[PDB]
């Protein structure tokens, strides 16, 4: 059956003054982003492998040396037989004040390579347009989970599952107070189930409470597998975060 | 019939934070250093029971931002508490300056590992019985080998096992002067035996020799497999280092 | 096995002004892993076989001032025994800003091979012969697990990115200047990478602009244990030097 077209939303932090990060990011690792969400778009789409048969022409513009919240969005906008193609948008806003100093579109044309015994007859379902989503003031980002985050078993360290929590109640908390952000706590936190290598992490973070100078975020963490779109909800985490100049005032 | 007892050994996970390196400070005093904190516990449970774990949950932390100078951070686990499958690993996050060595945080936290056993005698697992230590009177450090300093053939590359002699060498010869120091120079390294990516690398350092600018730090590499236990030296290496401002007195 | 002749291979690392981390790692630990996987590099595309580092003989470092550096790491194989590769290593650091060689570290790597197979127990290294002094920039890296897919297949983005590094240094290197990317062209992918396999960038100026360059990029990929080459990709990437922009 048909299916409407998802935005895939990627995030990634610039802290002030990280010149390599920033260099990169600005730069060819921003491109390397950009395909990657790319990528998990089309997979969620089509739920087959894809690869990346090719990328039109892509304008770059460098910002100042300040710190920015990247985000990296991907829509499929066009589906063949094995062609998708994915738009993407990477928006960068300042870390301090929140102001967007990038906004670079790049088109990718991914192509899917099916595996199996009915490979010979799979094809893309029929794209329809993505419905307006009702606005949340609720981070959803996702990344793919790598090998140096899994252990041998091909499980993710929950640490570094926390970690990516974390990452999201970072952005949501400077999001919210136009300030950059330090962790001051957070709660107890308990995993439902283990995640896996060939999936993606999901995270929904969004501010609870805001006192003087500290908010609280919640975050919820899902997986989801990348050919077969099985998901669960894996941990629900607590942060403390704290609006900083030396603290502020939110 | 009974596996026999054992006492509780301390794991020890060194990182660095440079002077200046914002997005290693504000990872690490951040989600990054959660990411650790588990990591550590992770390698201390596997140790002891020989078996796969997972991070069923982690209690609340706390945590405090030292000022944006370098640290030498340090990452401790101890098991504390066993049943039959879950074990309780407490760790010490703490941070000291490079220049100085003054210590600048101390977080605690509490992880719940939980042994998956394999194999088919799984369903009769039990973990050991924990005693405690005695607390004994040279660094000491462990890291988990990752795919990406790994070949395809599943063997650490050799420069990336000297790298973390390196940094061995560099803890030690720091933490010796209280000031940053350098690498001037590597002595001739013979490697016994390939490490392989299952495997743990144990750094043993210290300082052998001290001039009026410099100073000689001898390592020892080991590997470890993670569920036999099984250890072989691999490497011994001699780094001469150097104390810095251009130059110092150590 | 027919006689071979000793191909350099070259391994490039930019150290951005200000990145006080990897200036402190690549000027130390990570300088000295990057020499080896250039040496481990070099190795296996001579003996098309699986290789260790047996052992590394002395080095000394020179750490250079705080600024920025494009960094080289070339790889010579100089002897070979039946299974003994000895592999010379040079790792040159130039100015991003004015081009000026600022260290010189040179190393030495025993590799050994481990052969698998059938007719493993009888694999003798082809035998050695020194290659002639060749009269642009060309880099080799690994693929790393971490930018490859589940199905074994480095993402087109990193193959990108890749493209863009080389595309960095041949412009700055050609201005003697800090660069930066201003715009990519079409880039159609005639086959997926492979997690066994290195990447090898081409790169050199085009054209030149008052401020801006363009850089064409070629990238192949190459079968580590077969020696398979093809053509991947053709990238043309602009990139503009900067002080703020400024002349070339
Ligand atoms: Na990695």
């Known amino acids: 059956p048909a299916?409407?077209?998802?935005?895939?939303?990627?995030?990634?932090?610039?802290?002030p003054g990280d010149t390599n990060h920033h260099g990169t990011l600005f730069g060819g690792t921003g491109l390397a982003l950009m395909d990657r969400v790319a990528f998990?778009?089309?997979?969620?789409?089509?739920?087959?492998?894809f690869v990346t048969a090719s990328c039109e022409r892509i304008d770059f513009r460098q910002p100042a040396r300040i710190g920015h919240i990247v985000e990296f969005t991907a829509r499929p906008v066009?589906?063949?037989?094995?062609?998708?193609?994915?738009?993407?948008?990477?928006?960068?806003?300042?870390?301090?004040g929140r102001q967007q100093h990038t906004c670079t579109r790049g088109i990718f044309h991914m192509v899917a390579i099916p595996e199996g015994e009915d490979a010979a007859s799979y094809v893309l379902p029929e794209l329809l347009t993505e419905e307006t989503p009702d606005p949340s003031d609720?981070?959803?980002?996702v990344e793919i989970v790598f090998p140096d985050q899994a252990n041998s078993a091909g499980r993710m360290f929950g640490g570094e599952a926390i970690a990516y929590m974390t990452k999201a109640a970072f952005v949501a908390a400077s999001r919210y107070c136009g300030k950059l952000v330090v962790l001051a706590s957070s709660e107890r936190i308990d995993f439902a189930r283990?995640?896996?290598?060939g999936e993606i992490?999901?995270?929904q973070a969004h501010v609870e409470r805001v006192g003087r100078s500290s908010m609280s975020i919640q975050t919820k963490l899902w997986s989801e597998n990348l050919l077969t779109g099985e998901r669960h909800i894996t941990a629900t985490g607590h942060f403390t975060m704290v609006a900083v100049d030396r603290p502020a005032t939110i």
């Not at 299916?3 to 802290?15: K, M, P, S, Y």
């Not at 998990?40 to 492998?49: D, S």
């Not at 066009?78 to 301090?96: N, Y």
């Open 201 to 203: 992490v999901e995270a």
């Open 138 to 141: 609720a981070v959803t980002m």
């Open 40 to 49: 998990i778009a089309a997979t969620r789409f089509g739920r087959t492998p």
């Open 194 to 197: 283990a995640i896996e290598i």
């Open 78 to 96: 066009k589906a063949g037989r094995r062609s998708l193609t994915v738009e993407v948008e990477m928006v960068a806003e300042t870390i301090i």
């Open 3 to 15: 299916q409407h077209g998802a935005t895939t939303r990627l995030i990634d932090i610039v802290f």
